[PDB]
Design a protein around this ligand. Structure first.
Ligand SMILES: Nc1ncnc2c1ncn2[C@@H]1O[C@H](COP(=O)(O)O[C@@H]2[C@H](O)[C@@H](COP(=O)(O)O[C@@H]3[C@H](O)[C@@H](COP(=O)(O)O)O[C@H]3n3cnc4c(N)ncnc43)O[C@H]2n2cnc3c(N)ncnc32)[C@@H](O)[C@H]1O
Length: 285
């Protein structure tokens, strides 16, 4: 009976039924009940839905403002995902630390970057967020070379151009930080799954001196990734960089040129061939 009312409390929050939430709480429901799959509380749900009135109701009934769910996220971190400056401010007044993180290393600032929440990003910055923190994760994950990413890498990966610009021009983000795998923001940008913003992002990173001689998982370089995405403009800008190594091979033994030929990218292939050792570059495809 007690357990079903606790589940009803969570659903009432999710359905934004204030009167029912009040009734269940006054009836003795556990304001800090955690559901079994993810450890979510009433308060986590209220923050996720950006409902400041429900948040305040739960806090007045004794909700623990810093109680974490199973991934280690606090209400404060969920407020960053929601982009709610008012809730970020509230949890900072109740014991949150601006640089706190979940169990995979995500801070509020990183989450604002991931979710493109510019107002929250700016608020957090002015509250002392460390812009260049690298994700500290679980020992088992760190041993698999996971972890170490920054908010800039998240902005690059998710294609949030305005966030990226703010990070680089206003907040002192380090363009050439690398995660535990050796990937920088440039690699993460070229790995992204949305073809919408990759060109703009890559150009911005290169403007700020992003290092082109870096490797992702299976030996992939920025140049190889750009060839795989068939983007002539990006290959052109990458080749304008001074220290770029055109002859690097990925784990399959392929260079950018060999891949360009296989994908039948005539202009890219000729460009790459001309930069290399070969004398016969116009007739490859
Ligand atoms: N109201 C509710 N809303 C949502 N889910 C709910 C709700 N009520 C109950 N549930 C139940 O809870 C379960 C767990 O959901 P959770 O969000 O609490 O925990 C997720 C996962 O379990 C847990 C571990 O996931 P994973 O093993 O796939 O691990 C992901 C990745 O491999 C790892 C490291 O990332 P990286 O450093 O390599 O980039 O962190 C996770 N991750 C990726 N992006 C993240 C992000 N932006 N923020 C935080 N974590 C992120 O992380 C949460 N998570 C995953 N992707 C996320 C993302 N994009 N944004 C925010 N959180 C994310 C859910 O499965 C669900 O059944």
């Amino acid at each position: 009976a007690a357990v079903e009312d606790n589940h009803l409390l969570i659903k009432a929050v999710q359905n934004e039924d204030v009167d029912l939430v009040q009734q269940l709480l006054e009836g003795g429901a556990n304001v800090n009940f955690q559901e079994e799959e993810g450890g979510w509380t009433p308060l986590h749900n209220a923050v996720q839905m950006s409902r400041e009135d429900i948040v305040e109701l739960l806090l007045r009934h004794g909700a623990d403002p810093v109680l974490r769910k199973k991934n280690g996220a606090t209400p404060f971190l969920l407020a960053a995902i929601a982009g709610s400056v008012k809730l970020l401010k509230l949890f900072l007044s109740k014991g949150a630390d601006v640089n706190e993180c979940d169990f995979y290393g995500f801070t509020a600032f990183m989450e604002a970057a991931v979710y493109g929440k510019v107002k929250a990003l700016k608020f957090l910055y002015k509250r002392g967020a460390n812009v260049n923190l690298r994700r500290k994760t679980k020992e088992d994950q760190e041993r698999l070379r996971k972890g170490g990413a920054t908010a800039l890498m998240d902005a690059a990966e998710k294609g949030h151009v305005e966030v990226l610009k703010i990070l680089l021009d206003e907040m002192g983000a380090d363009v050439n930080a690398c995660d535990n795998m050796g990937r920088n923001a440039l690699i993460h940008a070229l790995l992204s799954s949305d073809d919408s913003d990759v060109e703009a992002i890559t150009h911005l990173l290169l403007d700020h001196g992003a290092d082109v001689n870096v490797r992702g998982e299976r030996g992939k370089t920025p140049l190889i990734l750009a060839v795989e995405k068939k983007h002539l403009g990006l290959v052109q800008r990458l080749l304008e960089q001074e220290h770029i190594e055109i002859n690097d091979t990925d784990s399959d033994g392929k260079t950018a040129l060999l891949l360009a030929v296989e994908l039948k990218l005539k202009k890219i292939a000729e460009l790459l061939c001309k930069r290399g050792a070969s004398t016969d570059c116009g007739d490859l495809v």
